[PDB]
């Protein structure tokens, strides 16, 4: 039920918790042993913590690669391909440390030797001096934590198998199969170690509130509030003997409650009485100290003391030392589960507090300048850029601190207005070429003595600055070639430079991505009919028959076919509008006819159709016939709505709301109620700044013809309501946010363009509608006035009486309706 991607997401969360556990172990528990060289030799430490450090390094490396992979995964892949992340490591036998670790930690005599190390001269006192809770945490909790690497690595074997089975990429599947194979030795090795009885018991030892309620329901004589009203998890369930009590109590341990019960299993009960297996004896709230107790001739051995607030202490005894260990692990663990986090946290800061940047010199690397309101303006939770110089925009496009795949698309989609392709390539290659820092004083001292430098700072710089910046540069290249290949198609040299750049990249830490991009580029070089799911519906005819174009008119053509043919027509006009006709608000300038021809053809068609509807109505003087005309137009509207042709819907609405038509009260009075509602709902789409229309366009399912008018108004306002550059300290920064906004709109338009209509074109009807010319050779003002005067003639203003007019149509006015027929 889980996809490859779910497993990867789950795994990332798991390894992050795990890494935190490794840190706790290393910085909090192990560091104090390492620090006391006099008490513990290298081996003593080694014998307790084994190769924990190598495992931590391997883990941070694994997570890091997986993280980059995910972020660099474009929409072109079914899921991030992590097979290689694992294969690269398994091939270098990087998981071997786990077998050695498991061997050291699961050896039969581990714990005994561990205790001897804690009980030798001065050890216990030294551990106590570290701080409150350390000695207890070390003795009873650390041995459990030390098993974490074993559980973690064992899950790897299962994880890889599931990924292999679920992979949706053949190359990814192959890598996984290979990783699995390369890990067989480590796995059988650990398998032998973990199956031995003692180890098996140890692992088992440290391995939906439905349980909480199920447990309370089996306990008689409950006191206080419910378990769920103070507990969040169930920890342990065992048996213990209360020093002083008569019967061994069964105990349920929750993070918030240690419940002590008496078992009445199988004992007789009176009818109507509780049948619960247990009886509550002690209900202890977990928020107080826990002390360890030495054996006493008092028959109590394997005991510990619990201390409650203002209450009297209680002492318990377990069946064995193993049982006592499990309880102290959970009880102490449950006590300092915070303090130890503290111990860590406090150090986590200091560790991250001594690190001083040291970016490349601004004289050798242009992307090093400081950030200031002179080259980039952030927006008043990653930073959001308001404005900046091209240099700063590119630095942020490939920043080392955080991620923002949203930035890459925005930039690649809009950069051409403020930066040329050739120049963009030069800048990212320049960004990619980061000079490494000179050896520090400590490095020079080592080199000077003939030995190998630790190069601590150099390694940190490669890991936290160079790698993420170079990977991000490569990410831009991949997306650029993948989804904006036209830049390369139009400039041969641009492509040659990219291919040469990618081919010059050396190092194994990039080979995976270099090889990938090279292949993607070659696939783009190697390689307008329409295919449909179903078949288009049959063309419908009414009074006018096929081939008799001379009889075509509003009432003689079938209303269904009028809506369909106009939708095909309007769809093609919409689909032909290019972004170049919108950017810079060119449709509003003097050269609009030259720069926005397809946009204007679309708008002019809409206007012409609206006027034709108005003309058809007011030129039909007879009231009854005019009613039939209005009614037919509303039915055409109904079909437009079914076809998601919003432009068509609005042409009808604009017509019904024009001055000449809006005032014909006698006409609309005779329109059936169902149709008045249809018209009213359509009109409501435009109200309150098209609120309902916008919602409808977002909830419908293509193919459709949005109304382009809305887009035009938003582009125009965005263009003149935002400055082209933003001033800062005096420099001139390109306002890229203004461009991201225009591109967001052109992007919405494009998301709706690709989806074809599954309808058959009818040549003659299409021709009829392409040649509609309601205005004739008359000017706008004259025609507009003509329509309004016609309106006054057919329905005079009050108190003038309504006159009568003769019929003009010689054919039946009954509509064939808008429900399609199914014969062919």
Euclidean distance between CA atoms 523 and 488, whole angstroms? 13
Using CB atoms within 10 Å of the CB of residue 330, give its burial: 0 to 12 exposed, 13 to 18 middle, 19+ buried: buried
Task: Compute the Cα dihedral for 314, 317, 318, 321 and give only its sign.
Answer: positive
Rounded to whole angstroms, what are the CA distances from 179 to 66, 94, 99, 324, 774? 15, 11, 16, 41, 73
Give the chain's domains with CATH numbers. 1-207 (1.20.900.10), 208-353 (2.30.29.30), 354-528+703-755 (1.20.870.10), 529-702+756-799 (1.10.840.10)
Cβ pair 28, 183 in contact under 8 A: no
Pick from 205, 212, 264, 210: which is nearest to 238 by CA? 205
Q: Which two tokens stand for residue 405?
A: 């795949």
User: How crowded is residue 821: how many other Cβ atoms within 10 Å of its Cβ?
Assistant: 12
User: How crowded is residue 740: how many other Cβ atoms within 10 Å of its Cβ?
Assistant: 18
Cβ pair 282, 257 in contact under 8 A: no
Query: DSSP characters for 344-389?
Result: HHHHHHHHTTS----PPPTTT-GGGSPP-TTTEEE------EEEE-
User: How crowded is residue 529: how many other Cβ atoms within 10 Å of its Cβ?
Assistant: 3
Euclidean distance between CA atoms 431 and 413, whole angstroms? 20
**Experimental determination approach used:** X-ray
Euclidean distance between CA atoms 604 and 597, whole angstroms? 10
> Which phi and psi angles does 732 have, rounded to 5°?
-120, 105
Residues ≥6 apart with Cβ < 8 Å to 318: 238, 239, 240, 241, 302, 303, 324, 327
Residue 227 DSSP one-character state: G
User: How crowded is residue 69: how many other Cβ atoms within 10 Å of its Cβ?
Assistant: 20
Cβ pair 567, 757 in contact under 8 A: yes
Euclidean distance between CA atoms 798 and 20, whole angstroms? 84
Reported resolution in A?
A: 3.6
Cβ pair 326, 238 in contact under 8 A: yes
Q: Are strands 234-242 and 314-317 parallel, antiparallel or unpaired?
A: antiparallel
Euclidean distance between CA atoms 596 and 414, whole angstroms? 19
Pick from 634, 585, 579: which is nearest to 749 by CA? 579
User: Rg of the chain over CA atoms, in angstroms?
Assistant: 39
Euclidean distance between CA atoms 584 and 593, whole angstroms? 14
C-beta contacts of 188-191 below 8 A and 24+ residues apart:
189/99, 189/102, 189/103, 190/98, 190/99, 190/102, 190/150, 190/153, 190/154
**3-class secondary-structure state, position 512:** helix
| 259 beta partners | 252, 283
Residues ≥6 apart with Cβ < 8 Å to 69: 80, 81, 82, 84, 85
Cβ pair 140, 325 in contact under 8 A: yes
Task: Compute the Cα dihedral for 342, 346, 347, 349 and give only its sign.
Answer: positive
The kind and range of the H/E element at 727 are strand 725-728
Q: Are strands 278-285 and 219-220 parallel, antiparallel or unpaired?
A: parallel
Euclidean distance between CA atoms 112 and 119, whole angstroms? 11
Residues ≥6 apart with Cβ < 8 Å to 803: 796
Kindly tell me the number of DSSP H helices and DSSP E strands found in the chain: 39, 12
C-beta contacts of 13-19 below 8 A and 24+ residues apart:
14/152, 14/155, 15/59, 15/62, 15/63, 15/66, 15/152, 16/63, 18/59, 18/148, 18/152, 19/56, 19/59, 19/60, 19/63
Cβ pair 479, 498 in contact under 8 A: no
């Amino acid at each position: 039920e889980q996809t490859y991607y779910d497993l990867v997401k789950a795994f990332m969360a798991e390894i992050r918790q795990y890494i935190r556990e490794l840190n706790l172990i290393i910085k909090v528990f192990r560091e104090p042993f390492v620090s006391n060289s006099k008490l513990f030799s290298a081996n003593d430490v080694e014998n307790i913590f084994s190769r924990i450090v190598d495992i931590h390094e391997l883990s941070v490396k694994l997570l890091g690669h997986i993280e980059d992979t995910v972020e660099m995964t474009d929409e072109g892949s079914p899921h991030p391909l992590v097979g290689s992340c694992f294969e690269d490591l398994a091939e270098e036998l990087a998981f071997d440390p786990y077998e050695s670790y498991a061997r050291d930690i699961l050896r039969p005599g581990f714990h005994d030797r561990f205790l001897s190390q804690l009980s030798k001269p001065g050890a216990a006192l030294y551990l106590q001096s570290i701080g409150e809770g350390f000695k207890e945490a070390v003795q009873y909790v650390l041995p459990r934590l030390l098993l974490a690497p074993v559980y973690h690595c064992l899950h790897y074997f299962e994880l890889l198998k599931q990924l292999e089975e679920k992979s949706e990429d053949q190359e990814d599947k192959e890598c996984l199969k290979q990783a699995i194979t390369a890990l067989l030795n480590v796995q059988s090795g650990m398998e032998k170690i973990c199956s031995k009885s003692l180890a098996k018991r140890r692992l088992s030892e440290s391995a939906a509130i439905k349980k909480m309620n199920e447990i309370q329901k089996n306990i008689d004589g409950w006191e206080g509030k419910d378990i769920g009203q103070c507990c969040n998890e169930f920890i342990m369930e065992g048996t213990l003997t209360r020093v002083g009590a008569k019967h061994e109590r069964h105990i349920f341990l929750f993070d918030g409650l240690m419940i002590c019960c008496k078992s009445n299993h199988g004992q007789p009960r009176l009818p109507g009485a509780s049948n619960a297996e247990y009886r509550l004896k002690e209900k202890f709230f977990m928020r107080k100290v826990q002390i360890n107790d030495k054996d006493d001739t008092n028959e109590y051995k394997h005991a510990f003391e619990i201390i409650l607030k203002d209450e009297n202490s209680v002492i318990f005894s377990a069946k064995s030392a193993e049982e006592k260990n499990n309880w102290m692990a959970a009880l102490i663990s449950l006590q300092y589960r915070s303090t130890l986090e503290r111990m860590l946290d406090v150090t986590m800061l200091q560790e991250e507090k001594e690190e001083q940047m040291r970016l490349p010199s601004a004289d050798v690397y242009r992307f090093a300048e400081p950030d200031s309101e002179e080259n980039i303006i952030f927006e008043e939770g990653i930073p959001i850029i308001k404005a900046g110089t091209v240099i700063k925009l590119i630095e942020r496009l490939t920043y080392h601190m955080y991620a923002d795949p949203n930035f890459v698309r925005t930039f690649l989609t809009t950069y051409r207005s403020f930066c040329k392709p050739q120049e963009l390539l030069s800048l990212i290659i320049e960004r990619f070429e980061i000079p490494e820092p000179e050896p520090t004083e400590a490095d020079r001292i080592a080199i000077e003595n003939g030995d190998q430098p630790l190069s601590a700072e150099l390694k940190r710089f490669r890991k936290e600055y160079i790698q993420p910046v170079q990977l991000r540069v490569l990410n831009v290249c991949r997306h650029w070639v993948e989804h904006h290949f036209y830049d390369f198609e139009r400039d041969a040299y641009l492509l040659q430079r990219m291919e040469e750049f990618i081919g010059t990249v050396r190092g194994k830490a990039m080979k995976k991505w270099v090889e990938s991009i090279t292949k993607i580029i070659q696939r783009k070089k190697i390689a307008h009919n329409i295919t449909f799911q179903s078949s288009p519906p049959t063309v419908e005819w009414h009074i006018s028959r096929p081939g008799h174009i001379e009889t075509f008119d509003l009432l003689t053509l079938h209303p269904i076919e009028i809506a369909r043919q106009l939708t095909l027509l309007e769809s093609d006009l919409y689909r032909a509008v290019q972004p170049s006709e919108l950017v810079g608000s060119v449709w509003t300038k003097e050269d609009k006819e030259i720069n926005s021809p397809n946009l204007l053809k679309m708008i002019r068609h809409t206007t012409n159709l609206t006027l034709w509807f108005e003309k058809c109505i007011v030129e039909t003087e007879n009231l009854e016939e005019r009613v039939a005309v209005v009614s037919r137009i509303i039915e055409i509207l109904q079909v437009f709505q079914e076809l998601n042709n919003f432009n068509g819907v609005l042409e009808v609405v604009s017509a019904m709301n024009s001055s000449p038509v809006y005032r014909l009260d006698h006409t609309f009075e005779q329109i059936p109620s169902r149709q008045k509602k249809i018209l009213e709902e359509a009109h409501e789409l435009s109200e309150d700044h098209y609120k309902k229309y916008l919602a409808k366009l977002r909830s419908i399912n293509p193919p459709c013809v949005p109304f382009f008018g809305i887009y035009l108004t938003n582009i125009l306002k965005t263009e003149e309501g935002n400055p082209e550059v933003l001033k800062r300290h005096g420099k001139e920064l390109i306002n890229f946010s203004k461009r991201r906004k225009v591109a967001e709109i052109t992007g919405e338009i494009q998301q709706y363009q690709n989806q074809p209509y599954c309808l058959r074109v009818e040549s003659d009807i299409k021709r009829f509608f392409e040649n509609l010319n309601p205005m004739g050779n008359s000017m706008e003002k004259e025609f507009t006035d003509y329509l309004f005067n016609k309106s006054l003639e057919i329905e005079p203003r009050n108190p003038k009486p309504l006159p009568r007019f003769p019929k003009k149509y010689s054919y039946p006015l009954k509509s064939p309706g808008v429900r399609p027929s199914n014969p062919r």
